[PDB]
Amino acid sequence: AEKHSEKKLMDSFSPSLSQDKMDGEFAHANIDGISIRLCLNKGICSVFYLDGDKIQSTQLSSKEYNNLLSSLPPKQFNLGKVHTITAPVSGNFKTHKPAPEVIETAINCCTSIIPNDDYFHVKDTDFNSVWHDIYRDIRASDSNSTKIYFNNIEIPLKLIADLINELGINEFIDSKKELQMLSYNQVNKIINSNFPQQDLCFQTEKLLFTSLFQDPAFISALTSAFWQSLHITSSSVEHIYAQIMSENIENRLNFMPEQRVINNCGHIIKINAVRAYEVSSSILPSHITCNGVGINKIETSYLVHAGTLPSSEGLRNAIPPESRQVSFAIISPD
Incomplete structure (x- = not known):
């Protein structure tokens, strides 16, 4: 109420x-x-x-403020400090993965912006691994926490796999390749394979995704979101990230030296049209806390302009470090 x-x-x-x-x-x-x-x-x-x-x-008070932090929306705020949000479960050190509540909490929690005044310049190597990065991640998505949305609409993972496959993204595509865009005919095949329902809403989605999917800027936005080093934008991010991993390592040694612990739970990718795109790409590496298996949410957001070509050249030029905003949060089991 x-x-x-x-x-x-x-x-x-x-x-x-x-x-x-x-x-x-x-x-x-x-x-x-x-x-x-x-x-x-x-x-x-x-x-x-x-x-x-x-x-x-x-x-x-510090308490009322942490309460406030947990109720903020999943946006990037200048908090000037990486906070820990408690999820509604008690942790244990005999598990290899975060509990569902931790995953859920991480998905929906706000994060704190890492100031990027000393941002890195574009390098010729930026986005080199992007095709293999999306391939590997989608391939493993059927047991992932990976979810992808356009305008608050879950794009079914099987449909992403069908798209990425016909875009010719596989295990040996060639890093430098520029993706040839799908015909209306081609995408219409996949889309219809993955949307049997005839409801007006499904019909609207079919139409929506048919238009996107032929938009190279959209393909560029979707694929870029998976680049493994998307978030390394500055010495400052490096520093925060190093402090976080040190804490992860200490807690692991202290609390669960023997326990296995999965590395990462996949990407949460939200894409919206501004035709240009706003991307929010969050990675969810596991993070051992003093309560159990938690998550370090690292989110990167950026704009992909209308004419962007789906290639490593297109991407590093369209999405330089300076235009990516990076934010962090720690999510802990209670």
Whole structure:
């Protein structure tokens, strides 16, 4: 009851990039005349309530603030610190994979932006492995947590495999190759193979994916999302990532030296049209915490412009480090 309203606000919250935000403001929500601003000052979170001209505020304790963090939408905020979100399960050190609740929590949690002032330049090697990267990942998806969405619509994995296959992406395609785009005839085959249902909604989806799928910028957006080094955009990311892996290693040695632990649970990829595309590509490597098998959510978001060609040249030129935003979160079993 009171829970939908709550989750409906909260989603309303967006990162504050605005140049005219309050001091330390990292998020805002503007609801029908009212505005809420969330600010950090020396790591302390305050909430500002703007009803026209009133302006009241509240300073949150560390507890109330972590509660707030867990209820934010899965967006990239400038939190200035990689946080740990607790999932609703008790961990144990006798498992090889995160519990479903940890996976679920990781899928839906906000993350903290790693500032990229010292971003790397485009290199000739960028996106070299992209074709083999998507192949390997889709091949292993039938036991993955991999999910791919266009505009909040799950694209069935079998349909992705059929697409990637007819695009000629396999185990020996040649890294430098530029993908030839599928005819209307070709995609129409796959799409219809994977959408038997005749409902208006399925008919709309069939149409939607028929149009995308012939859009090279879309193919480029989808495939680029799987590049294994997509997120290495700066020394700063390197540094955070190293600190995180060190903590993973320490907890592993400390808590489950003998236990096997899977490395990664796959990609969560959300794609939206702006014709151009916004991509959010999250990788979910496992992360041992003091409670059990958790996840380190690393999310990269970027824009893919309308004329992008599906090749390593097309990709590294369309999606340079400077235009990717990288964010982190740790998700822990309770």
